[PDB]
Amino acid sequence: KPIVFSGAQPSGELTIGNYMGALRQWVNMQDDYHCIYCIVDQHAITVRQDAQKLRKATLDTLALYLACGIDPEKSTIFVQSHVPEHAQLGWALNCYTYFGELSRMTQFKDKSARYAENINAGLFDYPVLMAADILLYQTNLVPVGEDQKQHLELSRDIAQRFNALYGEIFKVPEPFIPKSGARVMSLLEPTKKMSKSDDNRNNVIGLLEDPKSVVKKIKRAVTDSDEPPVVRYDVQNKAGVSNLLDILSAVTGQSIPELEKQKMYGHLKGEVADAVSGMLTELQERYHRFRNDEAFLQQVMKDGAEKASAHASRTLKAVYEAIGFVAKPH
Amino acid sequence: TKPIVFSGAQPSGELTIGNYMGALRQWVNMQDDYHCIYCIVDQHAITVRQDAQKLRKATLDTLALYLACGIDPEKSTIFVQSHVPEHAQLGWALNCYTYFGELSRMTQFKDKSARYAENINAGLFDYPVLMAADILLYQTNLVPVGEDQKQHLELSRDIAQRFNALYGEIFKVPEPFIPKSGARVMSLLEPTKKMSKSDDNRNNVIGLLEDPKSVVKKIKRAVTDSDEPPVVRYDVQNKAGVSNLLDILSAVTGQSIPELEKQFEGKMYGHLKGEVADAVSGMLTELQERYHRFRNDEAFLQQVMKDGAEKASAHASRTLKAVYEAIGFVAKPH
Numbered sequence: 001k002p003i004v005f006s007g008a009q010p011s012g013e014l015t016i017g018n019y020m021g022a023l024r025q026w027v028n029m030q031d032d033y034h035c036i037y038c039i040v041d042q043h044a045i046t047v048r049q050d051a052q053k054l055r056k057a058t059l060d061t062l063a064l065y066l067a068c069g070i071d072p073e074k075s076t077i078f079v080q081s082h083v084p085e086h087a088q089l090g091w092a093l094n095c096y097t098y099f100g101e102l103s104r105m106t107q108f109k110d111k112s113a114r115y116a117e118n119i120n121a122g123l124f125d126y127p128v129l130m131a132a133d134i135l136l137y138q139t140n141l142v143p144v145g146e147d148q149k150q151h152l153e154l155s156r157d158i159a160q161r162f163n164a165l166y167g168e169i170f171k172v173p174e175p176f177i178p179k180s181g182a183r184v185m186s187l188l189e190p191t192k193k194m195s196k197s198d199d200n201r202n203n204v205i206g207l208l209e210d211p212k213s214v215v216k217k218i219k220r221a222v223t224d225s226d227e228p229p230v231v232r233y234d235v236q237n238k239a240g241v242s243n244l245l246d247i248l249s250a251v252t253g254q255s256i257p258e259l260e261k262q263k264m265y266g267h268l269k270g271e272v273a274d275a276v277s278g279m280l281t282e283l284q285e286r287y288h289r290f291r292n293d294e295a296f297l298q299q300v301m302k303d304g305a306e307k308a309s310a311h312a313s314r315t316l317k318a319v320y321e322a323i324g325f326v327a328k329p330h
Numbered sequence: 331t332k333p334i335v336f337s338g339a340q341p342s343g344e345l346t347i348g349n350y351m352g353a354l355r356q357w358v359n360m361q362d363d364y365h366c367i368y369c370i371v372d373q374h375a376i377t378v379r380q381d382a383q384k385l386r387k388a389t390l391d392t393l394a395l396y397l398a399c400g401i402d403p404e405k406s407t408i409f410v411q412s413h414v415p416e417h418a419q420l421g422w423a424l425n426c427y428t429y430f431g432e433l434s435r436m437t438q439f440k441d442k443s444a445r446y447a448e449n450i451n452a453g454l455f456d457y458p459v460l461m462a463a464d465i466l467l468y469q470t471n472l473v474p475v476g477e478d479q480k481q482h483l484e485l486s487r488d489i490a491q492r493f494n495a496l497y498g499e500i501f502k503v504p505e506p507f508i509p510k511s512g513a514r515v516m517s518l519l520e521p522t523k524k525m526s527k528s529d530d531n532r533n534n535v536i537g538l539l540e541d542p543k544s545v546v547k548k549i550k551r552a553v554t555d556s557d558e559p560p561v562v563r564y565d566v567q568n569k570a571g572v573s574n575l576l577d578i579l580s581a582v583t584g585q586s587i588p589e590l591e592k593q594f595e596g597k598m599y600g601h602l603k604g605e606v607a608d609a610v611s612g613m614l615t616e617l618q619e620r621y622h623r624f625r626n627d628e629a630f631l632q633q634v635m636k637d638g639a640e641k642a643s644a645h646a647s648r649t650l651k652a653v654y655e656a657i658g659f660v661a662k663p664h
C-alpha cells in the first residue's frame with residue numbers, strides 16, 4: 001500500500017474550500033493507502049497567531065478531521081509540533097534547497113504582500129518544512145488543492161536531489177489534486193481563492209457555519225452583471241457564478257446538469273445555501289461530539305504522534321547517517 | 331548561581347589559531363566562573379557542502395581538539411548539536427520571529443554566497459536563526475565569539491527581545507564576549523580576509539596541530555608591505571600583513587600594540603616573524619601533547635558526547651517547553 005501524507009494549518013476554521021480541495025480526498029483514500037494526516041501548527045505560526053486562538057484552533061482542526069471521517073483506526077493523525085523529527089529534517093533539507101527556489105514561490109510573494117509587516121524567515125522557509133513533513137514518511141502521494149502544486153514540485157526536486165547525492169533515502173512524492181473543487185474562490189472577491197485565514201469572514205464558508213449564516217453569505221456573493229443573467233461557466237468573465245457552480249457541482253458531482261437550470265442568480269444562491277448546509281449538519285453533529293470529548297482528542301494525538309514518531313525517526317536516522325552526522329549515543 | 335556561557339564551532343576543518351584566539355581560549359578561561367556549554371555545530375556545518383565521511387571525522391576531530399585545548403567535561407557541558415533535537419525545533423520557531431530583511435543584510439551570508447555561488451542554500455541564509463536557537467535554549471548570558479560573529483549575535487539579542495516583548499520573559503538576552511586582541515586573525519597570504527578553517531589554501535591558516543617547522547614556514551611567507559626601511563607599526567588600512575602579525579603576537583603574549591611597536595623600533599619584518607612563530611608554537615605545545623590521546627580514545631569521545639547531550643537536553647527541553655506554551659502549541663500528551 002502506497003503512503004499518503006497531507007497537512008492543514010490550524011490557522012482558522014476549516015472552510016468548504018479546505019474540504020473540497022483536500023479533506024474530502026483524505027477521507028476517500030483511507031482504505032487504498034496508508035494515510036497520515038497532520039495538523040501543522042509549526043506552519044501556522046509563519047503568520048502571527050493569538051496564542052489562545054492557536055491552541056483552540058489546533059483542537060478544532062483535529063475534531064474537524066474526525067468529524068469529516070478521518071478514522072484514527074485507519075489513519076495516523078497527529079500534531080506536527082509533537083514530532084520533533086519534522087523540525088530536524090526541516091533544517092537538514094534547508095541545506096539542500098536553493099535560495100532562488102524559495103524566493104520564486106507564489107505563496108511567499110502573495111503572503112508577503114498580504115503581511116508586509118511580518119515577512120519572516122518562516123514564511124520564506126515554508127516549503128522546506130513542508131517537504132520535511134512529506135519526506136519523513138516515505139510518502140508516495142500528497143492530496144492537496146491546486147494552490148500547493150508549486151510547493152509539491154519543490155518537494156519532488158528536493159527528494160530527487162538528496163537521493164542523487166546519498167542514495168534512495170526518500171520516496172519521490174506526487175500530488176493528488178482533485179479535478180473539481182481544487183480551488184474554491186472567495187465569495188466577495190471571486191478572483192482570489194477562499195482562505196481560512198481571511199480577515200474578511202464573509203469571503204469564506206466555514207465547516208461550522210449555521211444555516212442562517214450560509215444563506216446570508218451565499219446571497220451576498222459577487223456575481224456578474226450580464227443581461228439576461230444565466231448560469232454559465234466563464235472563469236474569466238463569470239467568476240462568481242462559475243465559483244458558485246463549482247461549489248454546487250463539486251458538492252453534487254453533476255456539472256452541466258446544473259448548467260441546464262435555465263432561473264436567476266438568487267435561485268442558484270438559495271440552492272447552494274441549502275445544499276451546503278445539509279452537508280455541514282451531519283459533519284457538525286459529529287464535530288460537536290468529538291470536540292467536547294477531550295479525553296478522546298488527547299488519545300488520538302498521543303497514539304498518532306507515537307505512530308508517526310516510529311516512521312519519522314526511521315527516515316531521520318537514515319538522513320543523518322547519509323549526511324555524515326555522528327549518531328546520537330544510546 | 332553562575333552566569334551561563336554558550337558557544338559553538340563548526341566541524342569544518344582543523345581549528346586554527348584564529349579560532350583559538352578569537353574564541354576557544356576564552357571558552358577555556360570562563361569554565362570556573364561561568365556555567366559553560368560548548369557545542370560542535372554539525373547542523374551549521376552542512377550549510378556548506380561536506381563530504382559525509384569528512385564531516386563525521388571532523389566532528390570527532392573538533393571534539394578531541396576542544397578537550398586537548400582544556401575544555402573540561404567535568405566543568406563544562408560538551409555536545410554535538412544534532413544530538414539535541416530542541417535546537418532544530420527552536421530554530422524553526424525563531425524563524426517565524428526573524429525578518430527576511432534582517433537575514434539578507436548579514437555580511438556572512440553575502441560573503442559565503444560569493445564563495446559558494448553554486449550552493450546558495452536556505453540553510454546558509456537561515457544560519458543566524460539556528461545560532462540564536464542554540465544560544466537562547468540555555469538561558470545564556472554570555473557568548474564568547476570572534477569579531478566576525480558580532481552581527482550574528484546582535485540578531486540573537488534582537489530575536490530574544492522581540493520574542494520576550496510578545497510573550498513575557500522567556501529568554502535571557504545574550505551578550506557577546508569578543509576579545510580585545512586576536513578577535514579577527516587574518517589570513518597569512520591575504521591579510522584583508524580573516525583566517526578561516528574552510529579555506530582551500532592551507533597556507534593562509536595555522537592549524538592548532540601544526541609543527542614548529544610548519545609554523546615558521548607559514549609565518550615566513552606571510553604577506554607584508556614594501557616599506558623600506560621596514561616599519562613595524564599597526565596600520566590595517568596601509569600595512570594589513572604587518573598589522574596582523576602584531577595582533578597575533580599581542581594576542582599570544584599580552585603585550586600591547588604600543589609596547590610591541592616600541593619593541594620593534596629599528597627592526598625588520600624578519601625579527602617580527604621570528605617572534606610571532608616562536609610565540610605561536612609555544613602557545614600550542616600543551617594541546618599538541620594531548621591531542622592524539624584524546625582523539626584515539628573512542629570510548630572517551632562517545633562518553634563525553636553522551637553525557638553532554640543528556641545535560642544539554644535537560645536545559646533545552648525546559649526552555650522549549652516554555653516557548654511552545656507561550657506560542658500557543660498544544661503540549662504533547664505525556
Ligand SMILES: Nc1ncnc2c1ncn2[C@@H]1O[C@H](COP(=O)(O)OP(=O)(O)OP(=O)(O)O)[C@@H](O)[C@H]1O
Nearest residue numbers: 008009011017021144145182183184194195196197
Ligand atoms: N480555496 C481552496 N480550495 C481548495 N483547496 C484549498 C483551498 N484553500 C486551501 N486548500 C487546500 O487545503 C489544504 C490546507 O491548506 P491550508 O491549511 O493552508 O488552508 P487555507 O485555507 O489556505 O489557510 P491559510 O489561509 O491559513 O493558508 C491544502 O491542501 C490546500 O491546498
Ligand SMILES: Nc1ncnc2c1ncn2[C@@H]1O[C@H](COP(=O)(O)OP(=O)(O)OP(=O)(O)O)[C@@H](O)[C@H]1O
Nearest residue numbers: 340342348352353475476513514515525526527528
Ligand atoms: N580569524 C578568526 N579570528 C578570530 N576568531 C575567529 C576567526 N575565525 C573564526 N573565529 C571564531 O571561531 C569560532 C568558530 O567559528 P567557525 O567554526 O565558523 O570557524 P571558521 O574558521 O570561521 O570556519 P568556517 O570557515 O568553516 O566558517 C567563532 O567564535 C568565530 O567568530
Ligand SMILES: C[C@H]1c2c[nH]c3cccc(c23)S[C@H]1C(=O)O
Nearest residue numbers: 006007008009040043130133148
Ligand atoms: C498545510 C500546508 C502543509 C504543511 N505540510 C504539508 C504537507 C502536505 C501538504 C500540505 C502541507 S498543504 C500546505 C498548505 O499550506 O496548503
Ligand SMILES: C[C@H]1c2c[nH]c3cccc(c23)S[C@H]1C(=O)O
Nearest residue numbers: 337338339340371374461464479
Ligand atoms: C559556529 C557558529 C555557531 C553556531 N551556533 C553558535 C552559538 C554561539 C556561537 C557560534 C555559533 S559562532 C558561529 C560561527 O559561524 O562562527
Ligand SMILES: [Mg+2]
Nearest residue numbers: 009147195196
Ligand atoms: Mg493555505
Ligand SMILES: [Mg+2]
Nearest residue numbers: 340478526527
Ligand atoms: Mg566561520
